[PDB]
Nucleic acid binder design. Structure first.
Ligand SMILES: [Cl-]
Ligand SMILES: [Cl-]
Ligand SMILES: [Cl-]
Ligand SMILES: [Cl-]
Ligand SMILES: [Mn+2]
Ligand SMILES: [Mn+2]
Ligand SMILES: [Mn+2]
Ligand SMILES: [Mn+2]
Ligand SMILES: [Mn+2]
Ligand SMILES: [Mn+2]
Ligand SMILES: [Mn+2]
Ligand SMILES: [Mn+2]
Ligand SMILES: [Mn+2]
Lengths: 104, 93, 97, 78, 94, 108, 84, 99
DNA sequence: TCAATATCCACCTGCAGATTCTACCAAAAGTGTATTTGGAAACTGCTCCATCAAAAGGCATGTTCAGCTGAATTCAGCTGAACATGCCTTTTGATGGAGCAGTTTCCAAATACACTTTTGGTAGAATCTGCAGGTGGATATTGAT
DNA sequence: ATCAATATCCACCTGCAGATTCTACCAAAAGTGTATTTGGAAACTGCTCCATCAAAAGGCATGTTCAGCTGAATTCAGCTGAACATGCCTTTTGATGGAGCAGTTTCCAAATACACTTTTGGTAGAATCTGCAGGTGGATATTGA
């Protein structure tokens, strides 16, 4: 009978609501706001896990580590833009060497 | 005492997309940071939106406009659909 | 009596380091620099070990990002060697200077 | 102490940065930038420490510092 | 009738204090108003965060002070802190 | 009943303590707002506008004008290291830029 | 109402030279003019897009100066002088 | 004679002149059409307060001028005096305005 | 080309640091039951925002011409890269003790409410008045010679 | 080193757009009296942070070539600045109609405030595994000759 199952979500609508009310964002919080926000947070999370999972698989591993979250994000145009000013600790960088620097 | 995080939820979502894939502790920390950051950005923008328009309450409408302002193109479209879908399914049964 | 030509090993290291994620600065020396700088703002401070690690992560990602922009500036001057003037220009355009 | 950040370690950073050839002067220039970077973040962190009346710099203090310096870092509480 | 506030009156009093002989164009006053509103927001915003990280629900002069040290560079911070402190100790002296 | 004293005069300030207190309560910055907060913030704001009006008034003087205009505000902000940093990502409409020509561009 | 087309060409070679001058530029390559228009275009679309989003959210048909000011603030391009 | 200033002399006089003033450098009506065109492609039937169009012009010009200063530093850095598209690109790249 | 010196790339293997999977139990999250109050309709004053009309000159557009700047080409120092060689800080681990981030209750001091009463500020409405042009001779500045 | 062609530079005027005072009317600060709540003191408690060795073990600090990159020199072809002739189209003024922003006024959903009831996470252990870190062997990628 939780709000998440009602909205058909895995993310916690109840907590998102409580976090919104106690964060000093507005005097009042509509009932739909935490549902919407929760769904949005869940979707973005699935999107990243999906691509990081693939990055893991392609590395011949079944456990997602930071490197993979970095490879998934930097190799995706939109995720890269959204997290342009964020650093993933222990993520390292994408292999990339300027052409001019190659031998011959 | 108690320190709450999104770990249990990120994990449940992990199983949906990759039933056989796991996740290290450090990677889980990254995901927690991510959820908190995006949560703050959306909430922060929704807060300004309502203030600019002299409204005292944040509704799904401010969350939707905030998502539109914060997420790049395709991500916004999908995010917007995922959200109105959850609000309708919640206002029904 | 075998020697690789200059640049060959340099390229090898780029490939190796762009492939890994471990911290490239020695830990103890870093912790020491951190505590010293902190002592000038507030005396007798303690540091959660994770506090020191976050600082090293942030600091090493920043320097790596900076070296990439420095590199683009050296290449723009049609050089292949980075110089102080390259770091200076990149910091100026970034608005840090 | 800053001299402890060595030529070879700075080389490694440069390599991950995709740099092939380094000038002799880059080492001291790099230490100066690293010092300014550390000074700015630590100063901000300690200000959060002192505000919370603590004597221990926490990862969260560092995370909040980095965040306002426009260097958001993921994985240490935010 | 529609009516909107602004810091114009105060900016003008302060202007007369430092430069008795000098006026200010309305376009310049507009910029001064954006400035005050902007700094008010940065300080309040940083004070809000500070209080939240410390599970405190009240913003006191102590939060405004730490926000000021975080936001303003060197000398400007020192002087602003001094003026704020002097105004508070005075205000509370009844 | 009692002599009406403004919080500003009690604080020895030109800037509005009442107004600022209200703006704090209504901006959703926190649940509660201490009595000293609006006093301290009104003073900092007043100190900062005094500092830029001092420098802008002088830029006005130098250009032989008695009326401060936007350009005067720009010259004062950009010629002052700290204000320039504080407002480093701000743009002043009708302010233009500081006269500055790279040396290499001059006739040899 | 008449159709609006190719107005980016309204940003002329001389207007762009002037902007470069104020920016301290002494010599300009012939290809700078088309690059500049493209860059200006991207800058203007992004700000307009955000400004119009604030307009719609308020259910207005008129973009206000405040809509533009909030849009510029969002993009780390704070503008003093037009309200807010 | 006829009299002719050498190339670069007038350019320098122009820099001093424009760095000395604050008026908008792009013609007003043309810029307003550009704004209306771009806007119309996002949402039809829009109107604009006149100050909204001016806020945009002030912002675009401060932005282009700031970008040319950085572009200029990239040209000088390549030991040139003439700005080229590749200097604008290098500056935008380092400014984080694009990959 | 050849020959050989180090570099990578595999497939396989076994320990072990983490990652999982268990079993509770107090803080949320979900219900029910009354207020409370946004902030949507519903007009509807009355700002401005489109939209000409018309004239005028500030500027955009093209074109000619050739100064001098951006490429291209060509070296010759030397500055960095590649390499052993030698030793010394950094790393790895437990103690072992102690400074000190959390809770634990007090409650006095500071805040958040309700009117109830005063005014400091914000619209227009008159009163000023810096200068934005407009015109001239210094003063330079440039560029030819 | 001297002008001649032009481009500032600095005062001196003078009537307006555009500041600067003027008054009324509130919207909203200021009192007072109460009802709450916040968040400091004084007293512990485990946590987890420094010291302290205590050795090895890479990893760093040094000199020794010398490969090949950067910086300094020319040398043009032709791009891009300066100057001019033309006459287009942005600017500057002035209405005018009417789209559409803001006001006031009601007035239900929809949200907050309050006890209760029930359920879900977070936490301190107990039970396994995904690969890290080696191995040995087999082509690679580099280079010298
Ligand atoms: Cl809602
Ligand atoms: Cl250099
Ligand atoms: Cl206070
Ligand atoms: Cl180019
Ligand atoms: Mn169109
Ligand atoms: Mn109401
Ligand atoms: Mn023509
Ligand atoms: Mn020629
Ligand atoms: Mn040249
Ligand atoms: Mn004049
Ligand atoms: Mn109508
Ligand atoms: Mn459970
Ligand atoms: Mn392996």
């Amino acid at each position: 009978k939780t709000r998440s199952s009602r909205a058909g979500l895995q993310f916690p609508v109840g907590r998102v609501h409580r976090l919104l009310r106690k964060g000093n964002y507005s005097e009042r919080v509509g009932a739909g706001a935490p549902v919407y926000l929760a769904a949005v947070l869940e979707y973005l999370t699935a999107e990243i896990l999906e691509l990081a999972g693939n990055a893991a698989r392609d590395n011949k591993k079944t456990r997602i580590i930071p490197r993979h979250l970095q490879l998934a994000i930097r190799n995706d145009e939109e995720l890269n833009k959204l997290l342009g000013r964020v650093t993933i600790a222990q993520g390292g960088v994408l292999p990339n060497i300027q052409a001019v620097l190659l031998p011959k | 005492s108690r320190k709450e995080s999104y770990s249990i939820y990120v994990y449940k979502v992990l199983k949906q997309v990759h039933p056989d894939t796991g996740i290290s502790s450090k990677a889980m920390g990254i995901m927690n940071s991510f959820v908190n950051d995006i949560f703050e950005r959306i909430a922060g923008e929704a807060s300004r939106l309502a203030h600019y328009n002299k409204r005292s309450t944040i509704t799904s409408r401010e969350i939707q406009t905030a998502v539109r302002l914060l997420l790049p193109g395709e991500l916004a479209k999908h995010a917007v659909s995922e959200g109105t879908k959850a609000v309708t399914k919640y206002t029904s049964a | 009596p075998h020697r690789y030509r200059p640049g060959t090993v340099a390229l090898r290291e780029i490939r190796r380091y762009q492939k890994s994620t471990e911290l490239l600065i020695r830990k103890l020396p870093f912790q020491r620099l951190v505590r010293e700088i902190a002592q000038d703002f507030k005396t007798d401070l303690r540091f959660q070990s994770s506090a020191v690690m976050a600082l090293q992560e942030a600091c090493e990602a920043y320097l790596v990002g900076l070296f990439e922009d420095t590199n683009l500036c050296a290449i723009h001057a049609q050089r292949v060697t980075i110089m102080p003037k390259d770091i200076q220009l990149a910091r100026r355009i970034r608005g840090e200077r | 102490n800053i001299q402890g950040i060595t030529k070879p370690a700075i080389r490694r950073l440069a390599r991950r940065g995709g740099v092939k050839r380094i000038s002799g002067l880059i080492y001291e220039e790099t230490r100066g930038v690293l010092k300014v970077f550390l000074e700015n973040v630590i100063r901000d962190a300690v200000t959060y420490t002192e505000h919370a009346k603590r004597k221990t710099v926490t990862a969260m203090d560092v995370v909040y510092a980095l965040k306002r310096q426009g260097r958001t870092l993921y994985g240490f509480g935010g």
